[PDB]
């Protein structure tokens, strides 16, 4: 079970014990909608409880909702089931999802029913990523974004951006502010999932599921476990940290009928990847993408890191030539790279003809591969074809 969950209760009291079918304890709560903790992740009575649970319909899709499944900008969806929020055969993915984008799709691309996650220093622009990538998916498959206790700027980059796009129209928004509530918050990506599983599950679609910051997440969870003495901490954050985390994201996957597809985002506090949100992240979903911050300071958009990011199913999606170039892509890239701190000290002149080439080569990537235009959606064949051309320019094979 997730060892939190979403209840519903009406006048529901702090400390107060309800019987699901376990028992838990109430440790949060806004209104009827309650957070319940379960008993093995507590140091320390009755009334019963109903999990917390939402309409589902395909009427979501267009509209834009708070973190409790409530309608902000659009009309009420009609309701065609109820859905518990707390979720619940499996396929390995072997499908490639294109980003349109060429520092994902060739080296690292993402897979139908993976997850994997982007983490971006502060400051980066994490936020345009995610729906650059949410306008070019939402051409071809249904999007749901999970937006977590986000900022009022960002907040309205996400409503402007996604109506003004149309993009909106195969999508569907779920968003808290950040000086919403904690539960709020924590609600956001449970109510985004479960619109996610009933479209994926039992409407047989392939969704993509783009759900940030999971910093923001994590800190609602440390702010209601604050004042809660009984509730143990491991590495500045609640204990049941890392099992909360793996229930959100196992919720989403291959099987016979649909996919979801999830990227969870978030920001590494000190750019420290050794954190305990990406450090747990990480370990959980099938690779990440890092953002750069060095890529950022010479003005690339998108900053991805090509040597840092990694994607554990690719390999299992792709082409015989596409795993060629990705092969020479990264190997270049990264002979290049040397090339490039070796000149820091000798300078050009110092190198063999054979650094200048992937040195030449590391430059073009970033200038003419890495860098694409928010609005430019590269196709595969594109992709490979400015590899090609690289590869021409700096005289390697
Ligand atoms: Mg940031």
Do not use: C, W
Not at 138 to 158: E, L, Q, R
């Amino acid at each position: 079970k997730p060892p939190l969950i979403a209840v519903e209760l009406e006048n529901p009291m702090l400390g107060e014990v309800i019987d699901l079918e376990t028992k838990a304890i109430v440790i949060a709560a806004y209104e009827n909608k309650a957070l319940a903790l379960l008993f093995d992740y507590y140091t320390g009575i009755n009334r019963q409880g109903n999990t917390y649970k939402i309409a589902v319909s395909e009427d979501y899709i267009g509209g834009i909702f708070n973190g409790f499944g409530e309608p902000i900008k659009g009309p009420k969806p009609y309701p065609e089931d109820y859905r518990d929020i707390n979720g619940l055969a499996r396929k390995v993915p072997n499908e490639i999802l294109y980003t349109g984008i060429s520092s994902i799709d060739v080296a690292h691309p993402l897979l139908k029913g993976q997850k994997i996650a982007i983490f971006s220093p502060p400051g980066l622009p994490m936020e345009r990523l995610a729906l650059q990538i949410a306008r070019n998916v939402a051409k071809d498959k249904t999007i749901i974004f999970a937006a977590i206790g986000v900022p009022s700027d960002i907040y309205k980059m996400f409503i402007d951006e996604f109506i003004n796009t149309k993009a909106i129209m195969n999508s569907a928004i779920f968003i808290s502010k950040a000086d919403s509530s904690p539960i709020e918050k924590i609600y956001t990506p449970r109510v985004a999932l479960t619109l996610a599983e009933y479209l994926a599950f039992e409407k047989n679609r392939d969704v993509l599921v783009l759900m940030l910051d999971m910093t923001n997440y994590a800190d609602a969870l440390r702010e209601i476990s604050t004042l809660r003495k009984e509730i143990p901490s491991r590495r500045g954050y609640p204990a049941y940290l890392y099992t909360d985390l793996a229930s959100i994201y196992e919720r989403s996957g291959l099987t016979s009928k649909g996919s979801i597809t999830l990227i969870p985002m978030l920001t590494m506090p000190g750019n420290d990847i050794t954190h305990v949100v990406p450090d747990l992240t990480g370990y959980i979903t099938e690779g990440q993408y890092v953002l750069s911050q060095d890529l950022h300071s010479k003005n690339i958009y998108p900053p991805i890191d090509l040597l840092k990011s990694l994607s554990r199913l690719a390999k299992n999606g792709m082409s015989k030539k596409h795993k060629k170039y990705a092969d020479i892509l990264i190997k270049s890239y990264a002979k290049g790279l040397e090339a490039r701190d070796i000149a820091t000290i000798v300078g050009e002149d110092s190198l063999s003809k054979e650094d200048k080439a992937y040195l030449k080569f590391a430059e073009l990537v970033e200038k003419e591969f890495i860098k694409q235009d928010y609005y430019e959606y590269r196709s595969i064949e594109k992709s490979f074809e400015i590899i090609d051309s690289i590869l021409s320019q700096s005289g390697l094979p």
